[PDB]
Amino acid sequence: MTPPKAEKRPYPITTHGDTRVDDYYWLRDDERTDPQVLDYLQAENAFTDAALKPQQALRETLYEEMVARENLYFQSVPYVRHGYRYQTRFEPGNEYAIYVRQPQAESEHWDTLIDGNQRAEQREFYTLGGLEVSPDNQKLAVAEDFLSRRQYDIRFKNLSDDSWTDEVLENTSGSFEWANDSATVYYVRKHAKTLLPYQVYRHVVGTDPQLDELIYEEQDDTFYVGLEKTTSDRFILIHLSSTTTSEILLLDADRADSTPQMFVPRRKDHEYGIDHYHQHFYIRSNKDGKNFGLYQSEQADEAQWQTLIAPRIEVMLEGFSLFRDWLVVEERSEGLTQLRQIHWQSGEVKRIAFDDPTYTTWLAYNPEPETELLRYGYSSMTTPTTLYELNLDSDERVMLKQQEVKNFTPENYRSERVWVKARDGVEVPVSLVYRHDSFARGTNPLMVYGYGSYGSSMDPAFSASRLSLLDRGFVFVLAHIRGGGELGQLWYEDGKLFKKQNTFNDFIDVTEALIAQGYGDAKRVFAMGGAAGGLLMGAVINQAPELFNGIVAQVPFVDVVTTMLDESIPLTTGEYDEWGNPNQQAYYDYILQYSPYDQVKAQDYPHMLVTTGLHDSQVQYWEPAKWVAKLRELKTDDRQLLLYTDMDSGHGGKSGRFKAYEDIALEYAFILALAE
């Protein structure tokens, strides 16, 4: 079958006297209306449909077995907050969650707080982006998106009679806090054009939003504006943060006329976050070390901050929770997540021990500090996600919930942590899982998954959908490459800006070691990654095409120089601290060397499926479309190259989780057919 051939319209882009001619610059159409652009995306979708037509039966088998291992009756673990018990309920044949509550001393009767199915009646789209009852338990504030544009309407329900007030706060981030009067709420307004959060307003419930007062306006575009409330309830925080740099303003939660009080003025490369409890500020801050410390203060002044935990090169400090008698910290060390608890009085330290080679642990939702019971999450490549509750004093651990997986026997699978010595001598961790009875050294197809940007960690956890590959002989690998966070801030920093190439080198060095050690069949190595992990997919296949049989590149960031030169593209002005600004000759040069679109060569490429989405305003559909067009023009092999563009507008990843399972089934069928 003859693949679609995009029209070439040579478009020169000249930077620092370097001219790049982009034949497909025209595929970018911000209005997503141009019929010629739509024609190319439709033709590629038709080609993908026709190429993958024989995989239909396998797609059905995969889809049905993925849905079959999940319950359709889900009920959350109930939690208590301000004398009420809260539960979320999904029943089969309901797109949306029902949220219920009852008085804490009640068992029998539950009251509906909000039914998403009911709220979605006569609407094209529904996302709940926020839910919070007032301190006096009388009012519900909800942040809802009916239009799919990530702009939230805040509305108010009287819980006494289930009546709604008739005002709406429009174009909000969904971030809002009640003042302690259960009458005033603070909310974040998004910029009209950029949709970036930039204003804090104050609303009296029951009044017209025209009466609302502007409390704070952020001048720096790169600074996210979010609202928080301290554990003590004494302060509403205006949390301002770039990727590198923080600033917190305090709002007295106990007055109706409060103005923002500076905590510590922003200083480039000083990231901090605060809470308030027991008459102290608690600060997680990188002021003295990239791996962060914890500080106590009676006042804002940075020089008064007292050190509770000093930053350590070996231990990244990720977060903390405050309880009556205990401090609990989330840390990473030697490539594992950990929890430690420290007694406020005795200074007694306990670590929460797990022996699984490939697990992750985290602080879960603990809305009440007056307790000895900690809720924390656990998952491994062999153990479905678990909520535990720990008695911090007695060390008694109970299981509150497990992820229910049907047709699944945990003993059928093995997992391992492998360390690979990268080409520059740096040790890269790897987490891998496979079915015991079908494993034979050098025989198995290998799926290598990476991300490797922003300090995001691909922490090893359980996947139900992954069983569809493991039960078909695949060794599934997480490559914990530089640019991720698995070994702390230095791990991230050694895979961004002028070290970004280490991300792609680590992925190739990991893949080569695994093949050398017989984890996979050299001829049946597959890889997948999405977004900045699609950047990884693009760079790896330019640099080392021969390693991989097949590739899935989801919504890939591939036109890196051109996108990062254009502040009109959503996200660009917030990403200079990740890739660099190619307006500077040093960054242009460094970035162009890996920018996958720019490094497409007349060479043999793996089989590849590239995905994207038309109407998702923060998915830049043109980048993978241009990339596929250029690959079609230059590649020397006869292997399959497909572009699938989601033409939808709605549902996304939840409720249309069936859409999510459909995409997984398509992608896994594509790979399984190549590995057969």
Author numbering: 2 to 677
The authors write:
In this study, we described for the first time the structures of bacterial OpB from S. proteomaculans (PSP) obtained by X-ray for an enzyme with a modified hinge region (PSPmod) and two of its derivatives. The enzymes were crystallized in the presence of spermine and adopted uncommon intermediate states in the crystal lattices.
PSPmod and two its derivatives (PSPmodE125A and PSPmodS532A) were crystallized in intermediate conformations, which are characterized by a disruption of the catalytic triad typical for ligand-free enzymes in open states, while domains’ closeness resembled closed states of ligand-bound POP. In the PSPmod structure, the distances between Cα-atoms in the pairs Ser532–His652 and His652–Asp617 are equal to 18.2 and 10.6 Å, respectively, which are longer than those in the closed states of TbOpB and ApPEP and comparable with those in the open state of TbOpB and intermediate states of PfPEP and GmPEP. Similar distances are observed in the structures of PSPmod derivatives. As a result, five, three and two bound Sp molecules were found in the structures of PSPmod, PSPmodE125A and PSPmodS532A, respectively. Sp701 is present in all structures, while Sp704—only in the PSPmod structure. The second Sp of the PSPmodS532A structure is in the proximity of catalytic Ser532 similarly to Sp703 in the PSP structure.
